[PDB]
Design a protein around this ligand. Sequence first.
Ligand SMILES: COC(=O)N[C@H](C(=O)N[C@@H](Cc1ccccc1)[C@@H](O)CN(Cc1ccc(-c2ccccn2)cc1)NC(=O)[C@@H](NC(=O)OC)C(C)(C)C)C(C)(C)C
Lengths: 99, 99
Amino acid sequence: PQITLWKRPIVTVKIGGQLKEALLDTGADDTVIEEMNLPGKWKPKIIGGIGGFIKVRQYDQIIIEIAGHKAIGTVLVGPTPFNVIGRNLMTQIGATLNF
Amino acid sequence: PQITLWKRPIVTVKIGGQLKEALLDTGADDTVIEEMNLPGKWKPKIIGGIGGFIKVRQYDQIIIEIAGHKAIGTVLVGPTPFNVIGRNLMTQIGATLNF
Ligand SMILES: COC(=O)N[C@H](C(=O)N[C@@H](Cc1ccccc1)[C@@H](O)CN(Cc1ccc(-c2ccccn2)cc1)NC(=O)[C@@H](NC(=O)OC)C(C)(C)C)C(C)(C)C
């Protein structure tokens, strides 16, 4: 699709077998999802945004389906009220910025 | 252009007579630039994201060239960890997310 930027670029994604809403964020290195149980082992990570740093749990080889594309890679689980899809997964589905 | 997301989508921007590097940031409502001098009056604004909030000064109708494309709009100036171009100016240059 071509997503315009009049509003926040929030789309539906599939994680854990369920549909969720997440913002496609070209300014995010990483994918960060609100608290939830994921399969497997995790490692601590610290990530920084506009207001400073938070601690999150890093899960590897997590599948998130986006527009029919299966991206697989690192997903961070943190205390955020939303889901952010970062570049690490958007690269896998072929997402580009165009102007 | 068409910009892939394997690296941070950082472009050259011209603002206030200076060249700066800035991140094309679909996860930003606003455009936020490190401390600098801008013409005109300003209003206080509080903006937030990961880690919490920072205090910034809002300047309106600022001329800014983004990768060779003209935009005139609101620029927020404050202690941002990173210079970001937000949706408010990316829409002006016709930027879309595509996959
Ligand atoms: C290397 O660091 C990062 O990549 N940091 C990322 C990050 O915070 N990205 C920022 C840009 C940035 C990068 C590095 C340091 C400082 C800032 C944004 O891409 C995402 N971010 C955090 C963010 C992500 C998703 C959402 C959101 C909203 C509705 C539904 C789903 N998500 C809101 C804020 N957005 C904001 O903070 C914006 N806030 C904003 O627009 O608030 C309305 C600002 C900028 C205008 C302040 C993550 C922590 C998400 C991985």
